[PDB]
Copies of this chain bind each other. A is one copy, B any other.
Amino acid sequence: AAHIGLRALADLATPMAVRVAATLRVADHIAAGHRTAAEIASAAGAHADSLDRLLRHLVAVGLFTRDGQGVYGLTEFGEQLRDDHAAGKRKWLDMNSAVGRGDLGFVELAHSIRTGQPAYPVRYGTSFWEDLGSDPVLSASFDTLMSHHLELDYTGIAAKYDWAALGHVVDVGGGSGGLLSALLTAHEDLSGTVLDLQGPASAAHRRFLDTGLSGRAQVVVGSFFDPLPAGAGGYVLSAVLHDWDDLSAVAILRRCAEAAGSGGVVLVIEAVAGAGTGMDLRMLTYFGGKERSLAELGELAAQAGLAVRAAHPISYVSIVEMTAL
């Protein structure tokens, strides 16, 4: 990151200003015709002088434009803040979304680096999953988010592997079914089931029902720490292991080992170290999880009686295939 000055490199004013902008939808208000601080503030329900001061800072940062009359506009860059923008980044920074909220837990990083425990609880007084499990709205935003992460990192994962051969795929921690839906849409004789908590499971169900996939896709509300529906061709763990510490990760893999038996395949699909150090710190502060390497996944697999037998990179992530030892 060049040579800014340690103080500027540790600046919180700017990223927080962006996050607040995202949350106030300032960009969308600007496009809808509100351009002065007074108008924008009224539209967003913010303090005029304070909002104006925030905008002046973001103008400097390079997201907004401001003319002598006090009329603000967006820049090529500031366009990415619009809620309708193609990259859909605004929702990730919105302090109301699960991740826009979770990231503020970074303000407690010290506790994580000191104890190895997650920081999120220090800030919100409860674990991440517990927090979602009791706030359906919050949980829904998280589902939408993980759904978006799929379009972003798993484009065409359907062809990058022989899914059809599996016959039946169990998506352990499958969220709202975005991935399973994708697999089944590309392989018409394939069937599967999403195993997750109440929130995502019900969402997965709504999706399959509305999409005309209920004939091949089913959901099951359960904890992947307990026995899984057994006998399927393959068990998928998409963005799930890095959310857990080593001990819980093997517990999970262990359950997939058993469900898969001697004829099943366990497929860990996530950002393998090699997926930056930023995401790794997020896993640490959120759940005390971590981004792992193929070697590190190999170790976990060994403890669960599995072995890596393949690892296919597919854009941002990789599909590491494990089978009974």
Residues of A whose CB lies within 8 Å of any CB of B are: 1-3, 5-20, 22-24, 45-47, 49-51, 53-54, 56-57, 60-63, 76-77, 80-81, 87, 89-90, 92-93, 95, 103-104, 106-107, 109-110, 112-116, 276-278, 280-282, 284-285, 290
Residues of B within 8 A of A115 (CB): 47, 50
A-B complex: 9 closest residue pairs judged by Cβ atoms: A57-B277, A47-B116, A10-B18, A12-B106, A6-B89, A6-B80, A1-B62, A16-B109, A107-B107
Distance in Å from the Cβ of A95 to the closest Cβ of chain B?
Answer: 6
Task: Name the CB-closest residue of B to A15.
Answer: B10
Whose C-beta in chain B lies nearest to the C-beta of A3? Answer: B77
Q: Which residues of B contact A1 (CB under 8 A)?
A: 14, 61-62
Provide the residues of chain B in CB contact with A17, threshold 8 Å.
109, 281
Q: Are A2 and B62 in contact (CB under 8 A)?
A: yes
Selected from B5, B51, B112, B114, the residue in CB contact (under 8 A) with A113 is B51
Structural contact, A7 and B89, CB atoms closer than 8 A: yes
Alpha-carbon gap, A15 to B1, bound state (A): 12
Q: Within the complex, what minimum Cβ distance (angstroms) separates A82 from chain B? A: 10
Q: Is the CB of A15 within 8 A of B18?
A: no
